[PDB]
Design a protein around this ligand. Structure first.
Ligand code: ADP
Ligand code: ADP
Ligand code: ZN
Ligand code: ZN
Lengths: 518, 266
């Protein structure tokens, strides 16, 4: 239970077994449902759009993100300036713990407010300007709505703070980690220089000089390592001034805050929560702005998000199909404006004619507005062509419009949505099939291990458990380097060099010692 | 044993098929009170006819997705209702007579009812029902209103339902195909694929019909249960003990007689 085992390819060029202790807190954090969902998302993403070249790099990065999340969860878990600081940190920990419950509460409050808003009315006389008053027999609904709006704004602000205390540290950690890797292993600001079109790199240029560049990233010696790597070629004083480091002190923060705030304000989830807070503020100005919070169901409910993924999977194709419909309706509009101007009179009264194709603009508007929303096309709307010299031409006009625009060009949209459903389904099926057919770490198929009954299950649960690899990375990171054993130090060095050659690729303990075991 | 009888009656009354038959009996009783209650027995065709039940499985396979899609349609129609109630109140008059106006968007409740009842059942959306916006300062806004309603609610949000049903048909079909393929490719008991046994002509057919017949395993369990324990042979007693201990290690997993004695037979 607390004894974890992994297999690595060691310095002896053969697969080896490493045994280490797993903490119960770490195991519980792994079993947590949010961590499980993150793991499933990572697995799906890698299997769907990944290859063997970078799979281990992606897996290591995912493990690092999970370890940092576990540290955040452990920190926020609950067991005159001092008193107020204790109150502040306890309050912030409570918010971080209950972020998701607060989001659910905000959704419930939006539904309650929008249910109350269904009793609204408009009156010319107060209860030519019109007066909007909420009408209800009991009358408790007005105070209920006022207090619900206040409580909703408060809960939205609390959601913003809880996000800032819970999810922002991971964003900053990922940013610092990526910058350190691409500065130490790519020479991003030493040899290559940013492309001046990468706003990400250009803004990251502001944090190199800062005295506290790594604050969430656990690599404290990043500056020293990059200096040792690039000094002998690119100078040492130049590197020291680039990194804001004093060479003399090596032997014997508003700038960082600005950079972090820029990184946070460039974050999509934070921007969405800020928009939620803004519309919650505007609800007090005009209660009906609270209907823009109903759109939060798409972001909240996983079933709704999965259904809307069918619409968004072929979004560019849908947009192009709408543009194609617009072009073909323009073509029909041109033909009408040149040959069928008489039939487009939409006035029964002979006192004034209301011909709607005497101008190209109004005829295109008429076509796009009524011919595509009519079941039979434009011939549903325009004058009957019977008893006319253009009867055959006009029936060809109408029926081609009906075939191409009404039938073909909406069948294209429906087929795009149906094909999206099918494609997402087969993507999930392919991911599951690959995961249950071949081992994630070594890639050896289940056919090999199935010779022993339950062989593949045993191999994936015990021998090559990716959870065990993540736990071993936690063990290495949290263990002091002086007390590393030989194999622990070997893996630690290979990890510091970003070389994933200790992962058994195509080899396993069974395959290596088959002769001796059998 | 009144206590045992009470427990059994509770278990029976918690049974779905028994409850359905009791409902059938109740509606049959109510038919005498009002003969037209006998039309509720026509719903029994779904439970009776396997073809009908299989067809309705396409509807029920994605039932939660259908319910969520209807709720999404309700939400988006509420959004359009809010926009109408705030900006397009004039166009919703459904009375030809000028003696009394019948504006149907002067209240949020009645405008939501009007939208959900006529705009989603109209072919062109709400613009099929409401006043024409030509010659108005809100003409462009209102054509955007109507056409976005038509695109999102009429087209997209019913294409979602139709695609859910079509994908249900396809998913059920491929589930049946996958079950058949697995069953005809690998042995049920030992899991060894047909590729191994096909070296001998009709080898897989012989193996599944004779060597590893699940029907034979069921019959052997009948034999064990109905045979007195004192007259069990050694292997019968071994299997009986493993069965009493709920240990299924006597089922050949990944191994068979051919694979074991291949050297001697060949
Ligand atoms: N290296 C691996 N580590 C863990 N599971 C693996 C690995 N390679 C393949 N798998 C397969 O991944 C599947 C995931 O199932 P499981 O490990 O129970 O997790 P979950 O049910 O949370 O997805 C299993 O069928 C397992 O055989
Ligand atoms: N252990 C097994 N026992 C019986 N049939 C098996 C077994 N493993 C695989 N099969 C396959 O199951 C399929 C079922 O066909 P059959 O046994 O004739 O029954 P039915 O036609 O009633 O489904 C056959 O193709 C057979 O090869
Ligand atoms: Zn493996
Ligand atoms: Zn078999």
């Amino acid at each position: 239970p607390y004894l974890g085992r992994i297999e690595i390819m060691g310095a002896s060029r053969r697969i080896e077994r490493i045994y280490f202790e797993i903490s119960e807190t770490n195991r519980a954090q792994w079993e947590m449902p949010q961590v499980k969902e993150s793991k499933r998302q990572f697995i799906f993403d890698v299997v769907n759009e990944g290859g063997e070249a970078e799979k281990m790099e992606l897996f290591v990065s995912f493990c690092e993100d999970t370890i940092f999340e576990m540290q955040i969860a452990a920190q926020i878990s609950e067991p005159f300036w001092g008193e107020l600081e204790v109150q502040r940190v306890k309050f912030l920990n409570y918010l971080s713990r209950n972020f998701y419950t607060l989001r659910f509460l905000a959704l419930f409050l939006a539904f309650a407010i929008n249910f109350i808003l269904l009793f609204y009315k408009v009156s010319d006389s107060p209860p030519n300007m019109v007066y909007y008053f909420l009408e209800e027999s009991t009358g408790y609904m007005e105070p209920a709505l006022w207090c619900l709006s206040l409580l909703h704004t408060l809960v939205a602000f609390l959601c913003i703070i809880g996000y800032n205390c819970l999810k922002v540290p991971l964003v900053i950690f990922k940013r610092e980690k990526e910058l350190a890797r691409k500065l130490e292993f790519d020479g991003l600001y030493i040899t290559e220089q940013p492309g001046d079109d990468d706003v990400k790199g250009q803004w990251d240029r502001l944090v190199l000089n800062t005295p506290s560049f790594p604050s969430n990233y656990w690599d404290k010696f990043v500056k020293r390592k990059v200096l040792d790597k690039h000094g002998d070629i690119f100078g040492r004083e130049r590197i020291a001034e680039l990194l804001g480091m004093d060479l003399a002190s090596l032997e014997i923060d508003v700038k960082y805050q600005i950079w972090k705030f820029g990184v946070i304000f460039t974050d999509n989830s934070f921007l969405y929560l800020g928009w939620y807070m803004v519309m919650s503020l505007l609800g007090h100005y005009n209660n009906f702005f609270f209907a823009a919070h109903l759109l939060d169901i798409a972001m909240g409910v996983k079933t709704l998000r999965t259904i809307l993924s069918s619409v968004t999977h072929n979004g560019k194709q849908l947009v192009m199909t709408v543009g194609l419909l617009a072009v073909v309706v323009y073509l029909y509009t041109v033909v009408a404006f040149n040959f069928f101007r008489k039939f487009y009179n939409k006035s029964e009264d002979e006192d004034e004619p209301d011909m709607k194709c005497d101008d190209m603009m109004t005829c295109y508007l008429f076509h796009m507005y009524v011919g595509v929303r009519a079941g039979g096309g434009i011939g549903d709307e325009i004058e009957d062509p019977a008893g006319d010299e253009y009867e055959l031409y006009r029936v060809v006009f109408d029926i081609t419009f009906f075939f191409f625009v009404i039938v073909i060009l909406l069948a294209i949209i429906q087929g795009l949505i149906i094909d999206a459903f099918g494609e997402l389904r087969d993507q999930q099926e392919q991911v599951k099939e690959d995961m249950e057919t071949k081992c994630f770490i070594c890639g050896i198929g289940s056919d090999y291990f199935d010779t022993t009954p339950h062989g593949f299950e045993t191999h994936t649960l015990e021998e090559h458990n990716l959870a065990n690899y993540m736990f071993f990375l936690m063990y290495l990171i949290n263990k002091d380097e002086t007390e590393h054993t030989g194999q622990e130090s070997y893996v630690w060095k290979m990890y510091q060099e970003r070389c994933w050659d200790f992962f058994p690729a195509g080899d396993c303990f069974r395959k290596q010692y088959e002769d001796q075991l059998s």
